[PDB]
Amino acid sequence: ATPKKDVYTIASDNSFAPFEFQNDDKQFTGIDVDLLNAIAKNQGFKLKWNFIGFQAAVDSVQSGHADGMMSGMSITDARKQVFDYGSPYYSSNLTIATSSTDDSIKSWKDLKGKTLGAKNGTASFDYLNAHAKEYGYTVKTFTDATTMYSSLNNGSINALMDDEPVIKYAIKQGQKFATPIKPIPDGQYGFAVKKGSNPELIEMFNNGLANLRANGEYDKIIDKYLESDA
Numbered sequence: 001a002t003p004k005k006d007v008y009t010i011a012s013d014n015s016f017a018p019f020e021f022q023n024d025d026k027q028f029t030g031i032d033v034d035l036l037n038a039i040a041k042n043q044g045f046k047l048k049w050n051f052i053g054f055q056a057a058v059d060s061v062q063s064g065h066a067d068g069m070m071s072g073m074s075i076t077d078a079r080k081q082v083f084d085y086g087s088p089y090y091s092s093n094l095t096i097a098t099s100s101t102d103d104s105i106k107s108w109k110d111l112k113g114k115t116l117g118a119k120n121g122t123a124s125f126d127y128l129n130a131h132a133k134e135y136g137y138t139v140k141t142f143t144d145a146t147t148m149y150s151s152l153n154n155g156s157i158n159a160l161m162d163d164e165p166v167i168k169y170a171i172k173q174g175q176k177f178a179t180p181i182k183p184i185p186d187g188q189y190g191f192a193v194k195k196g197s198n199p200e201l202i203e204m205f206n207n208g209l210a211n212l213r214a215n216g217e218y219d220k221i222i223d224k225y226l227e228s229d230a
């Protein structure tokens with residue numbers, strides 16, 4: 001894989017722990033950051049990051065600004081119409097979080113009349129929007145998970161949908177969230193470029209990921225955030 005730019009710009013979410021997030025000491029970090037940086041180093045590519053939000057990253061890549069996005073991004077057939085993806089590097093399901101002070105939601109049937117949050121442009125938004133009439137709830141959209149999570153904590157929304165590993169990590173950090181429903185299978189995460197653009201970034205992502213899966217660096221990066229409980 002041969003670089004064709006002196007630096008490539010990578011857009012990402014501004015709050016999606018453990019994949020990308022500002023830690024308490026105000027440093028951007030996470031699995032996506034460490035993994036893509038390590039892949040680029042393995043392959044001799046140079047990156048610069050813009051932590052701008054999920055939909056903002058989609059928009060930047062689609063407008064020919066960011067060269068790619070690494071943002072806990074689900075691989076879907078619909079997105080393949082406008083993005084090229086690299087090899088899958090993680091897996092996720094969708095789940096609901098409620099406040100753990102509230103026993104009123106025990107199933108999708110108890111969400112009738114409630115207000116649910118989701119982040120702009122995400123798989124969670126797509127799922128909630130598509131099921132809103134079926135289950136009788138309303139949807140409120142957010143551009144930063146910090147604002148969405150704050151709204152669940154302050155009671156201005158009754159529940160939210162987000163990716164399962166992100167909600168699990170939030171609970172591990174101490175968020176007072178409950179998880180009343182069975183997660184919805186939602187495939188894999190991938191690195192993405194605009195369809196037909198920057199093919200060498202996909203080549204080097206795939207080469208680097210295969211190398212780091214095989215040499216143990218991938219697992220070390222996952223462990224850094226998501227330790228074994230055994």
Ligand SMILES: NC(=O)CC[C@H](N)C(=O)O
Nearest residue numbers: 013054072073074122123
């Ligand atoms: N950063 C995110 O919120 C991504 C959520 C979800 N995996 C998606 O691709 O829509």
